[PDB]
Amino acid sequence: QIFGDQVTEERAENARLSAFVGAIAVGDLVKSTLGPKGMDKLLQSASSNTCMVTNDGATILKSIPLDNPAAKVLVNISKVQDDEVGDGTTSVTVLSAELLREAEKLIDQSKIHPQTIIEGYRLASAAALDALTKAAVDNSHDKTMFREDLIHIAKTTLSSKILSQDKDHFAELATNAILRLKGSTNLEHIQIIKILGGKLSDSFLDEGFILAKKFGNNQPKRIENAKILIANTTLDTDKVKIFGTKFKVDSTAKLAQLEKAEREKMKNKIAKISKFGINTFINRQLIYDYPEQLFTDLGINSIEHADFEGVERLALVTGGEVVSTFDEPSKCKLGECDVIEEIMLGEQPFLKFSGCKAGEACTIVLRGATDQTLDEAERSLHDALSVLSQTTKETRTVLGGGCAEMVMSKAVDTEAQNIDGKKSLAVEAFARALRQLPTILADNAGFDSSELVSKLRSSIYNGISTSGLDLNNGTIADMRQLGIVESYKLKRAVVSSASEAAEVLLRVDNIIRARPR
Amino acid sequence: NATFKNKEKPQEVRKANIIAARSVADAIRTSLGPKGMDKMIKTSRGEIIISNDGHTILKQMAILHPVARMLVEVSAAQDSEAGDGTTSVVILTGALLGAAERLLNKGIHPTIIADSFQSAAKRSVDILLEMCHKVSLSDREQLVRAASTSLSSKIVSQYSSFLAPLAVDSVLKISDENSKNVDLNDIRLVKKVGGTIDDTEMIDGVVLTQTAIKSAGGPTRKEKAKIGLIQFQISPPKPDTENNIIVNDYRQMDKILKEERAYLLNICKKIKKAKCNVLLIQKSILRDAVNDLALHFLSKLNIMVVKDIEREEIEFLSKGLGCKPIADIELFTEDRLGSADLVEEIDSDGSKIVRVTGIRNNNARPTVSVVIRGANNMIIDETERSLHDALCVIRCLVKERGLIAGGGAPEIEISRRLSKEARSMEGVQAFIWQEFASALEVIPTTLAENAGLNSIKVVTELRSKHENGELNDGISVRRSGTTNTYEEHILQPVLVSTSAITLASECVKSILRIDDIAFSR
Amino acid sequence: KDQGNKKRQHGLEAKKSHILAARSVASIIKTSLGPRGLDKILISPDGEITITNDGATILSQMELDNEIAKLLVQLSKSQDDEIGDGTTGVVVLASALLDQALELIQKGIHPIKIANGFDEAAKLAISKLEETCDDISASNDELFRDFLLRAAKTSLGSKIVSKDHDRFAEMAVEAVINVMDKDRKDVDFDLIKMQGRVGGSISDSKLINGVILDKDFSHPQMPKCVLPKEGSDGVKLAILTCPFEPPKPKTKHKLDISSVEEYQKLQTYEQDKFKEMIDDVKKAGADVVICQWGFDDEANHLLLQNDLPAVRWVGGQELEHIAISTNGRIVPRFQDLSKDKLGTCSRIYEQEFGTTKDRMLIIEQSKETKTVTCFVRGSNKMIVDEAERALHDSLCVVRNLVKDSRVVYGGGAAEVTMSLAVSEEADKQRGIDQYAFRGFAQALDTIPMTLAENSGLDPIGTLSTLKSKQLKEKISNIGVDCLGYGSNDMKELFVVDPFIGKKQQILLATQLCRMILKIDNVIISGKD
């Protein structure tokens, strides 16, 4: 007997089983979230007062802890998929769980060494990734078809989300937001504003980069030829090069006379800001009445409490510099635009920009009944916009609805025709994992997956490699006629991540814990 | 036979969900209708409460199961959107869940059930809307009759000839003939002890519950006033941290008093410099709202003071008067003031209530306040509730114009049509819609039973009479049978029936989709 | 005091118990022995989940009160510090020797007779090992550079770094050469530092022959780079632990003013001292300023106006890295700054790495250096940590190859050759020792058998083939198929271990076995 001090220890038989049972426990969290017809999970914290219902697989994996140290590995891997890619979280988690689920049987029943399984999965992965490439078709030419493809992608990427209710509108809103870019793929150019009142179908796309805060106490409602100088500086009772002078008097009148001194020092600082030749001044910090009036008297339009996200968005639109220090009129970049106008959206104040610098920006304005509705709408747009944005660099797509998965498993089954003995079952096991996604999709939709998946496979096998699941009618349909497409890049990420994710736990057969603290 | 082994049993969670939710609905079911049975609850404090109000019961039932609690939120949504039917939306939910349970046992996947019920709900709404009796806001008498009906079930019905047009005019003062969504939170019902039920007023600016100034020198009334909303306290310097003042003689007391008074004087002078004529101070117990010393200065400045104004009153003031809050005397300036033609305190049967009229400010919004009067607390409390419900009735009529007969009539009309129409559908469509339609009859069935009538007889008569007759027929507890409920003036706004069909679908859809419960810690 | 609540083992039963305790340790780490070895999940005291197959890390994270197991950990520590290769093998082999000792004891061979026999068997094993050695540094320098890189490439194949290991192998080769003079051939490992950041891919890693700071400049408007300035004497660096301003406390000031005359002077003093301190930088003749502390606004403007780029809040080791690389000094104060203390370099610049905002500051000599830093990138923490540690292993390999040119082929081939030699000599003993000599050889066999088992190969067919080839055809080293190559015979596969490594592995494992076998009594008290 070794170790001690109450540490966890698991040996070959136990740690190996735990690695697989853990990964399965992870899959059980999200296997119900796959597809537009997926089922919901009710989550509740120890306080009981935060009870929520969601079908967002990423939220569930992040919200629900597991005590299995091998499960923690797969959950962390799924996190990376969700944060870095923006889609495929459920698909990778399922495929990882199913690849490892089959691996458990391969060891226990088929007498396959863990090393044999890993190499077999690597060979099968190459077959699957090649299958995606050969089946991948772009419409780089004929801009009409590319724009249509983005709409079809959008409707798919909005699936399972609250926006799936009105996807006909949001598919075009999201697509237009990306088409507007004609440029950078960085989503930081696209803003989402969450407004209460109205229905989700009433969301608008506005290319004018709408700001959630207005300017001025008593200043004009429209700025022409605006020159934008951003700030992150303290302007309140700023004692300039007179530090250490305190106000101690025996009357209120004398104190007010001394406060003038702070105004004189602030006046110099504000004057130095005006020396830049600006019309609009934005400060991340608050602006007290003194510097506020000093800006007004000099004709400078005052915005206060422009938080971090605001400043960064302004940098991508107006082209100004945050300039935390205003001791010299030079060494600063100044932004510009044609118009800044006070505008009401849904009886809520905003500013509207026009003529900004090399504008690639736009705003999507959401209209919702509840905060929870809008929060889900905001995230759903973010996920869809990411895939749609990435599509503008990788324009190839494949057919969804289980079609790509059947095509991949077809190639993998073909690979098993020319394979050494020990690795043969591992390659076939990889294919069996791939076909679990269309099985789960059918099951969640309330259809007989055994019939639909078996018939679908025979369709893709005997040519007709256009068919897939119709998860609304419960039959087999041509995905090109229905418009069910998924980004090539995303499918490469899903297969790649699922393959590596399995390998990480396939290489584990022992769990060693140090003394707990 | 041999079928799915069902080693993993997700149905066990859905069964627990349905069982818990249906138990809540059946508990509320027995209180449906004017003849329903009372519920008694012993609260966590040991108090005994008795009520037949579904929503009040649900809040005090203290439901534990995470999913069954959702039936309480359903009643909250009904209370927020319609303001009526709060018992019926849960009861229909329970019956529709029972339909889902039977459909699950029949081999229909929960996913199919949820979507099929939604489709049935879509048709149910269309059936409901087409059969209603349309109204118009231009017909003041019609609105009075609608309100008078809902008032006829209140404790003091003899004044319904007054409370009905008061609710009607209160809405019309802020909602013209062409309006979709009327937020009756802009109609403030303000109670004060004294006077009688009919002795009510509708005031444009505001009705407050508090007095102004009683001390000598107070202006007690101001015309052409600018009004500010104060959330700070006006009192001599009184810090919370350690402090001491030493006074060994009247000479030092004089000095100290001058320091306290000069502080308040400077505040009062700044308020005057802002040209503020009336101070409306939010209630707080932290420091004196306005100290007597400040009142002496403010009185000499001809500034009115109203103290101990409740948060809800302050929020209304910010909309009716066009004025803004001031967080601190430091920022007390003109830009935060409203306007009013007259600010006065009314002493009628000892009321002594401050009110504002003639705001005439661009920042004002269509608000109105109602003066509720009465000697006993039960009178002003019953009047407020009576007017609130009446306002909810009218609000419903604006959102979806029209009323349908009560007594379960729209549930028989919808169910009867759906059962016949469903026979033309294919596959699970017809089988599920038959269960959906049947679930609807829980309402006319329960109403019959709670009224003391033979359950089967009444429903049988309702089915036959609706096939040959029309929506107007239904259960009348006053006639103790099935009669022409329209002619008996038993009417509910369309919105109540429309919303109940929607909520029942949304709740059951939400419940059926839950296949597990997990903790997040 | 307090004789009770103690554990004790002694005698023949302790001999079985102690060996079984050693077996328990080997039964865990044996599974990671080989280029295809399996990984462990190592759970920290705080629940942190890490994955590794580094036997040295695993044994370090194994926290145990079994005193016999501790002796095995001590063995792995010695090998990790001395050679850095055999940290798993010395424990697995030592266990194999103890397993043989168990049977030998049970058959009636005294533990001392076992210890003596194993020692003599080890001498035979090394005597044969020498016959199979060859030189890498011998003959054409190009062959040394070729083999040196190839040795690094193989050593990297056991970790995640294997994906893009071509670049990391080059880093190990350049790193060991850059800190080593051709004539002396002594490598000081401390001259090769490891550093890395989260972001990018491991293929983006590179060796930087200068100093890298994970710090930004004192003022966003301050120049980001200084060049040699058209043939002038490079860049002069002022490295201090004090900011160039009148120091001010972060707690209490306690500065008493007795008069108005003092008050006015005191406010002026601070403003003037800001100027004087920066002026002293110009008097020193420095181009850039590197301080442990940051700068106040007035110092930043004064440094800006005088074109004196400055780096804020630079850590202790980072200050030393500059002082060492630039052949300068760290000067506690300002009055001592001059050409005799300021550091020299050829360029200081800020480097961006794609979308990574670290914006590290790099100081280059642009010539032969005394020290290098290995810069590692990767898409996550665990990726950087493992790829960075992979360099540590490769650096140890090339370190040993420079110091001792004699190498032998690995893959277990050396153990099979030594096993065969000891086995053949055992029959010549004709005495009691024959049992220990045969046992020693059988213990050696456990290494190529472990390499088989951890690769999914039959260890019995594998070992039979290994011994058969080295007897039927030629004693020449025959390896195993653990790497998935078309065939064995490492001569064409470039799987090579240093002689000093394999020599120490066998001798140290034997010494440890004796360390445990000679223990006839263990008394364990409590832990205060």
Residues in chain C: 528
Are C284 and C401 found together in one domain? no
What are the distances in angstroms from CA C190 to CA B465, C83, C180, C501? 99, 14, 12, 20
User: Quick one: which of A418, A412, A424 has its CA closest to A112?
Assistant: A424
Contacts of B335 in chain A (CB under 8 A): 217-218
Neighbours of C259 (CB within 10 A): 8
Considering only alpha carbons, which residue of chain A is nearest residue B521?
A45
Query: b/e per residue, A124-160, with b = 16+ CB within 10 A?
Result: bbebbbebbeebbeeeeeeeeebeebbbbbbbbbbbb
| Contact (Cβ atoms closer than 8 angstroms) between residue A45 and residue B521 | yes
Question: Does an H or E element contain B354, and which?
Answer: strand B353-357
The answer to whether A308 faces chain C, any CB pair under 8 Å, is no
Residue B309 backbone phi and psi in degrees, to 5 = -85, 130
Residue A469 backbone phi and psi in degrees, to 5 = -80, 135
Query: Helix/strand/coil (H, E, C) string of C367-400?
Result: CCCCCEEEEEEECCHHHHHHHHHHHHHHHHHHHH
Interaxial angle between packed helices C413-426 and C111-131, expressed in degrees from 0 to 180 and rounded to the nearest 10 = 120
| Contact (Cβ atoms closer than 8 angstroms) between residue A4 and residue C69 | no
Q: What is the DSSP letter of B204?
A: S
User: Quick one: which of C142, C38, C22 has its CA closest to C71?
Assistant: C22
The C-alpha angle with vertex A90 and arms to A137 and A481, in degrees rounded to 5, equals: 35
User: Quick one: which of B455, B502, B501 has its CA closest to B475?
Assistant: B455
Residue C488's SS3 state is coil
Of C346, C369, C392, the residue that ends a domain is C369
| Contact (Cβ atoms closer than 8 angstroms) between residue B439 and residue B508 | no
Name the token pair of A509.
């057969």
Are C236 and C98 found together in one domain? no
A476-485: Cβ within 8 A, 24+ apart: A476/A452, A477/A401, A479/A399, A479/A400, A479/A401, A479/A403, A480/A399, A482/A401, A483/A152, A483/A155, A484/A152, A484/A156, A484/A399, A484/A400, A484/A401, A484/A403, A485/A149, A485/A152, A485/A153, A485/A156, A485/A397, A485/A398, A485/A399, A485/A400
CA distance C436 to C440: 6
Name the token pair of B48.
């005994």
Are C241 and C193 found together in one domain? no
Considering only alpha carbons, which residue of chain C is nearest residue A117?
C456
Residue B226 backbone phi and psi in degrees, to 5 = -100, 135
| Contact (Cβ atoms closer than 8 angstroms) between residue A266 and residue A289 | no
Name the token pair of A103.
């691996």
User: Quick one: which of A72, A94, A47, A62 has its CA closest to A379?
Assistant: A62
CA distance A264 to A237: 10
The C-alpha angle with vertex C108 and arms to C104 and C109, in degrees rounded to 5, equals: 55
CA distance C298 to C315: 23
Are C289 and C307 found together in one domain? yes
Contacts of A60 in chain B (CB under 8 A): 518
Are C231 and C361 found together in one domain? yes
C181 is catalytic: no
Strand order through the sheet with B340-346: B206-207, B353-357, B340-346, B221-225
Strand partners, A10: A511
Strand partners, C345: C235
Considering only alpha carbons, which residue of chain A is nearest residue B516?
A41
What are the distances in angstroms from CA C159 to CA A69, C37, C52, C196, C377? 21, 10, 8, 17, 15
The C-alpha of B517 sits at a distance from chain A's nearest C-alpha, in angstroms, of: 5
| Contact (Cβ atoms closer than 8 angstroms) between residue A494 and residue A415 | no
A318 is catalytic: no
CB–CB of A1 and C66 under 8 A? yes
| Contact (Cβ atoms closer than 8 angstroms) between residue A355 and residue A144 | no
End-to-end Cα, chain C, rounded Å:
14
Are C94 and C151 found together in one domain? no
**C–B contact (≥3 CB pairs within 8 Å)?**
no
Query: Helix/strand/coil (H, E, C) string of C101-156?
Result: HHHHHHCCCCHHHHHHHHHHHHHHHHHHHHHCCEECCCCCHHHHHHHHHHHHHHHH
Report the structure determination method: cryo-EM
DSSP characters over C212-259: EES--BSSTTS-S-B--TTTSS-EEEEEESS-SS----SS-------S
C57 is catalytic: no
| Contact (Cβ atoms closer than 8 angstroms) between residue B475 and residue B505 | no
What are the distances in angstroms from CA C316 to CA C72, C292, C334, C370? 37, 7, 18, 19
CA distance C451 to A5: 33
CA distance B282 to B309: 5
Interaxial angle between packed helices A89-108 and A69-84, expressed in degrees from 0 to 180 and rounded to the nearest 10 = 150
Query: Using beta carbons and an 8 Å cutoff, which residues of C are at the interface with A?
Result: 21, 24-25, 27-28, 31, 36, 38-47, 49, 51, 53, 58, 61-66, 69, 219-221, 266-267, 270-271, 297, 301, 379-380, 454-456, 484
Residues in chain B: 521
Considering only alpha carbons, which residue of chain A is nearest residue C72?
A2
**A–C contact (≥3 CB pairs within 8 Å)?**
yes
Strand partners, A340: A223, A353
| A neighbour chains, 3+ CB pairs within 8 Å | B, C
The C-alpha of B337 sits at a distance from chain A's nearest C-alpha, in angstroms, of: 14
| Contact (Cβ atoms closer than 8 angstroms) between residue A230 and residue A282 | yes
Which of C24, C36, C51 lies nearest to residue A73, judging by beta carbons? C51
Given the structure tokens 């462990």, which residue do they identify? C40
| Contact (Cβ atoms closer than 8 angstroms) between residue C191 and residue C341 | no
The C-alpha angle with vertex A98 and arms to A94 and A100, in degrees rounded to 5, equals: 120
User: Quick one: which of A294, A305, A293, A283 has its CA closest to A228?
Assistant: A283
Residue type, C368: E
Number of domains in chain C: 3
Neighbours of C198 (CB within 10 A): 15
Is residue C268 packed enough to be buried (19+ CB in 10 Å), middle (13-18) or exposed (0-12)?
exposed
CA distance A377 to A369: 11
Question: At a CB cut-off of 8 Å and minimum separation 6, what does B126 contact?
Answer: none
CA distance C183 to B111: 79
Interface list for A 106-165 with C (CB within 8 A): 113-116, 119
Question: At a CB cut-off of 8 Å and minimum separation 6, what does B467 contact?
Answer: B416
Question: What is the resolution of the experimental data for this entry, in Å?
Answer: 3.9
Chain centroid to Cα C414, Å, comes to 24
Neighbours of A44 (CB within 10 A): 17
Given the structure tokens 């220090």, which residue do they identify? A325
Q: What is the DSSP letter of C179?
A: T
Alpha helices in B404-454 (DSSP H): 409-422, 428-440, 442-450
Neighbours of C416 (CB within 10 A): 27
Is residue C260 packed enough to be buried (19+ CB in 10 Å), middle (13-18) or exposed (0-12)?
exposed
| Contact (Cβ atoms closer than 8 angstroms) between residue C28 and residue A512 | yes
Residue type, A187: L
Residue B17 backbone phi and psi in degrees, to 5 = -65, -45
Are C182 and C286 found together in one domain? no
CA distance A2 to C25: 8
| Contact (Cβ atoms closer than 8 angstroms) between residue A185 and residue A193 | no
End-to-end Cα, chain A, rounded Å:
22
| Contact (Cβ atoms closer than 8 angstroms) between residue A235 and residue A291 | yes
The third-level CATH classification (topology) of the domain covering B206-399 is GroEL (3.50.7)
End-to-end Cα, chain B, rounded Å:
44
Chain centroid to Cα A349, Å, comes to 28
Are C384 and C526 found together in one domain? no
Are C398 and C415 found together in one domain? no
Residue C134 backbone phi and psi in degrees, to 5 = -145, 170
Residue type, B102: R
Of C405, C432, C449, the residue that ends a domain is C405
User: What range does the domain containing C245 cover?
Assistant: 210-369
Q: What is the DSSP letter of C199?
A: B
DSSP characters over C315-337: -HHHHHHHHHHTT---BSSSTT-
| Contact (Cβ atoms closer than 8 angstroms) between residue C82 and residue C440 | no
DSSP characters over B324-341: -EESSGGG--GGG---EE
Neighbours of C56 (CB within 10 A): 22
Name the token pair of C404.
């001792």
What are the distances in angstroms from CA C152 to CA A108, A437, C113? 37, 42, 41
Are C237 and C157 found together in one domain? no
Given the structure tokens 């078309």, which residue do they identify? C486
User: Quick one: which of B73, B1, B79, B62 has its CA closest to B27?
Assistant: B62
Given the structure tokens 């989709």, which residue do they identify? B513
CA distance B92 to C385: 60
Given the structure tokens 């809008």, which residue do they identify? A374
